[PDB]
Design an enzyme around this catalytic site. Structure first.
Site, PDB file in Angstrom:
ATOM      1  N   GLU A   1     -96.420 -64.081  46.992  1.00  0.00           N
ATOM      2  CA  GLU A   1     -95.627 -63.605  45.879  1.00  0.00           C
ATOM      3  C   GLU A   1     -96.534 -63.283  44.665  1.00  0.00           C
ATOM      4  O   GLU A   1     -97.557 -63.927  44.433  1.00  0.00           O
ATOM      5  CB  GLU A   1     -94.582 -64.672  45.552  1.00  0.00           C
ATOM      6  CG  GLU A   1     -93.719 -64.392  44.346  1.00  0.00           C
ATOM      7  CD  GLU A   1     -92.938 -63.077  44.470  1.00  0.00           C
ATOM      8  OE1 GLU A   1     -93.502 -61.952  44.316  1.00  0.00           O
ATOM      9  OE2 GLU A   1     -91.745 -63.138  44.715  1.00  0.00           O
TER      10      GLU A   1
ATOM     11  N   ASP B   1     -93.273 -66.131  50.499  1.00  0.00           N
ATOM     12  CA  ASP B   1     -93.854 -66.378  49.172  1.00  0.00           C
ATOM     13  C   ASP B   1     -95.193 -67.089  49.194  1.00  0.00           C
ATOM     14  O   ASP B   1     -96.038 -66.831  48.331  1.00  0.00           O
ATOM     15  CB  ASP B   1     -92.877 -67.197  48.322  1.00  0.00           C
ATOM     16  CG  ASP B   1     -91.568 -66.426  48.083  1.00  0.00           C
ATOM     17  OD1 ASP B   1     -91.633 -65.251  47.577  1.00  0.00           O
ATOM     18  OD2 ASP B   1     -90.493 -66.957  48.399  1.00  0.00           O
TER      19      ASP B   1
ATOM     20  N   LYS C   1     -80.420 -66.954  54.101  1.00  0.00           N
ATOM     21  CA  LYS C   1     -81.828 -66.635  54.367  1.00  0.00           C
ATOM     22  C   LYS C   1     -82.202 -66.927  55.822  1.00  0.00           C
ATOM     23  O   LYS C   1     -82.892 -66.131  56.470  1.00  0.00           O
ATOM     24  CB  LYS C   1     -82.743 -67.411  53.427  1.00  0.00           C
ATOM     25  CG  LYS C   1     -84.183 -66.899  53.439  1.00  0.00           C
ATOM     26  CD  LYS C   1     -85.084 -67.703  52.468  1.00  0.00           C
ATOM     27  CE  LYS C   1     -84.980 -67.118  51.040  1.00  0.00           C
ATOM     28  NZ  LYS C   1     -85.339 -65.656  51.081  1.00  0.00           N
TER      29      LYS C   1
HETATM   30  S1  LIG Z   1     -84.456 -65.556  45.241  1.00  0.00           S
HETATM   31  O1  LIG Z   1     -85.211 -65.539  46.749  1.00  0.00           O
HETATM   32  O2  LIG Z   1     -84.768 -66.868  44.232  1.00  0.00           O
HETATM   33  O3  LIG Z   1     -82.927 -65.001  45.228  1.00  0.00           O
HETATM   34  C1  LIG Z   1     -82.176 -65.210  44.035  1.00  0.00           C
HETATM   35  C2  LIG Z   1     -80.806 -64.604  44.148  1.00  0.00           C
HETATM   36  O4  LIG Z   1     -80.910 -63.337  44.871  1.00  0.00           O
HETATM   37  C3  LIG Z   1     -79.978 -63.309  45.941  1.00  0.00           C
HETATM   38  N1  LIG Z   1     -80.532 -62.513  47.082  1.00  0.00           N
HETATM   39  C4  LIG Z   1     -81.757 -62.787  47.607  1.00  0.00           C
HETATM   40  C5  LIG Z   1     -82.286 -62.071  48.696  1.00  0.00           C
HETATM   41  C6  LIG Z   1     -81.506 -61.042  49.240  1.00  0.00           C
HETATM   42  N2  LIG Z   1     -81.952 -60.256  50.328  1.00  0.00           N
HETATM   43  N3  LIG Z   1     -80.319 -60.801  48.700  1.00  0.00           N
HETATM   44  C7  LIG Z   1     -79.813 -61.514  47.642  1.00  0.00           C
HETATM   45  O5  LIG Z   1     -78.736 -61.219  47.229  1.00  0.00           O
HETATM   46  C8  LIG Z   1     -79.682 -64.780  46.274  1.00  0.00           C
HETATM   47  O6  LIG Z   1     -78.453 -64.941  46.965  1.00  0.00           O
HETATM   48  C9  LIG Z   1     -79.775 -65.462  44.895  1.00  0.00           C
HETATM   49  O7  LIG Z   1     -78.521 -65.399  44.199  1.00  0.00           O
HETATM   50  P1  LIG Z   1     -77.543 -66.668  44.079  1.00  0.00           P
HETATM   51  O8  LIG Z   1     -77.444 -67.179  45.452  1.00  0.00           O
HETATM   52  O9  LIG Z   1     -77.879 -67.576  42.985  1.00  0.00           O
HETATM   53  O10 LIG Z   1     -76.150 -66.019  43.669  1.00  0.00           O
HETATM   54  C10 LIG Z   1     -75.958 -65.334  42.433  1.00  0.00           C
HETATM   55  C11 LIG Z   1     -74.718 -64.463  42.471  1.00  0.00           C
HETATM   56  O11 LIG Z   1     -75.074 -63.126  42.920  1.00  0.00           O
HETATM   57  C12 LIG Z   1     -74.060 -62.604  43.764  1.00  0.00           C
HETATM   58  N4  LIG Z   1     -74.624 -62.356  45.119  1.00  0.00           N
HETATM   59  C13 LIG Z   1     -75.759 -62.912  45.661  1.00  0.00           C
HETATM   60  N5  LIG Z   1     -76.048 -62.523  46.881  1.00  0.00           N
HETATM   61  C14 LIG Z   1     -75.030 -61.636  47.190  1.00  0.00           C
HETATM   62  C15 LIG Z   1     -74.770 -60.881  48.358  1.00  0.00           C
HETATM   63  N6  LIG Z   1     -75.554 -60.921  49.442  1.00  0.00           N
HETATM   64  N7  LIG Z   1     -73.667 -60.083  48.366  1.00  0.00           N
HETATM   65  C16 LIG Z   1     -72.895 -60.061  47.262  1.00  0.00           C
HETATM   66  N8  LIG Z   1     -73.041 -60.730  46.108  1.00  0.00           N
HETATM   67  C17 LIG Z   1     -74.142 -61.517  46.122  1.00  0.00           C
HETATM   68  C18 LIG Z   1     -72.900 -63.605  43.782  1.00  0.00           C
HETATM   69  O12 LIG Z   1     -71.975 -63.250  42.768  1.00  0.00           O
HETATM   70  C19 LIG Z   1     -73.604 -64.911  43.430  1.00  0.00           C
HETATM   71  O13 LIG Z   1     -72.727 -65.894  42.884  1.00  0.00           O
END
Ligand SMILES: *S(=O)(=O)OC[C@H]1O[C@@H](n2ccc(N)nc2=O)[C@H](O)[C@@H]1OP(=O)(O)OC[C@H]1O[C@@H](n2cnc3c(N)ncnc32)[C@H](O)[C@@H]1O
Length: 177
Positions: free
Chosen positions: A64, A92, A118
């Site tokens: 990363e 990472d 994941k």
């Molecule tokens: S990171 O590796 O520290 O990731 C941090 C946030 O990024 C999201 N993420 C990571 C990788 C991939 N390929 N997709 C992705 O979406 C991951 O879920 C982390 O978010 P959070 O889990 O804290 O949730 C924050 C809010 O974002 C919205 N969300 C997240 N992921 C979503 C997907 N796949 N579809 C729709 N909405 C999504 C939600 O509102 C969630 O509460």
């Protein structure tokens, strides 16, 4: 011109901010528009650097924070010299002590929701997954947390401090989106 954008820039160190801006532009995204993504990317970067600081001296290869092309070159060098299988998504770190990639994730939901997402997504079986939440929880593959407890505790404390700083600015609700 958003509050979140100015918050991010005073919350994270300039090196982190610069890497996060680079990472977004390289994917054609705009830190001034996707300001929640900006904050999440800076957070993930800081956690990864804090995590790599927890090892003994030469324990980790840091993936990363590099340009995407150079990050995959280093992954390729690791796979070609260790025999470990090539991950399908960029991890990472690589752990030279345990001989495995680490995919670190930071989540605003229950840890196991993002852990499971994941797991299903990389499907690269041998890659180690380690999730932190903004409420002090962590979840890791095989319940093997890699670092000593202090090095993980200070990551949890920093994440709750980020959460409090957003909440004090009325930014936490739309970030936790
Ligand atoms: S990171 O590796 O520290 O990731 C941090 C946030 O990024 C999201 N993420 C990571 C990788 C991939 N390929 N997709 C992705 O979406 C991951 O879920 C982390 O978010 P959070 O889990 O804290 O949730 C924050 C809010 O974002 C919205 N969300 C997240 N992921 C979503 C997907 N796949 N579809 C729709 N909405 C999504 C939600 O509102 C969630 O509460």
């Amino acid at each position: 011109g958003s509050h979140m954008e100015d918050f991010v820039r005073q919350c994270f160190n300039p090196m982190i901010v610069e890497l996060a801006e680079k990472a977004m532009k390289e994917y054609g995204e705009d830190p001034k528009i996707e300001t929640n993504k900006f904050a999440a990317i800076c957070t993930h970067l800081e956690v990864c650097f804090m995590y790599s600081d927890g090892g003994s001296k030469h324990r980790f290869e840091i993936i990363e924070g590099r340009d995407r092309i150079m990050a995959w070159t280093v992954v390729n060098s690791i796979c070609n010299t260790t025999g470990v299988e090539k991950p399908k998504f960029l991890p990472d770190l690589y752990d030279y002590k345990e001989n495995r990639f680490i995919d670190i994730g930071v989540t605003r939901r229950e840890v196991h929701i993002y852990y499971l997402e994941k797991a299903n997504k990389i499907k690269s079986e041998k890659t180690h997954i380690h999730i932190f939440s903004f409420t002090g929880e962590e979840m890791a593959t095989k319940a093997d947390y890699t670092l000593d407890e202090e090095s993980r505790a200070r990551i949890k404390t920093r994440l709750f401090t980020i959460r409090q700083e957003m909440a004090s600015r009325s930014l936490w609700d739309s970030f936790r989106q």
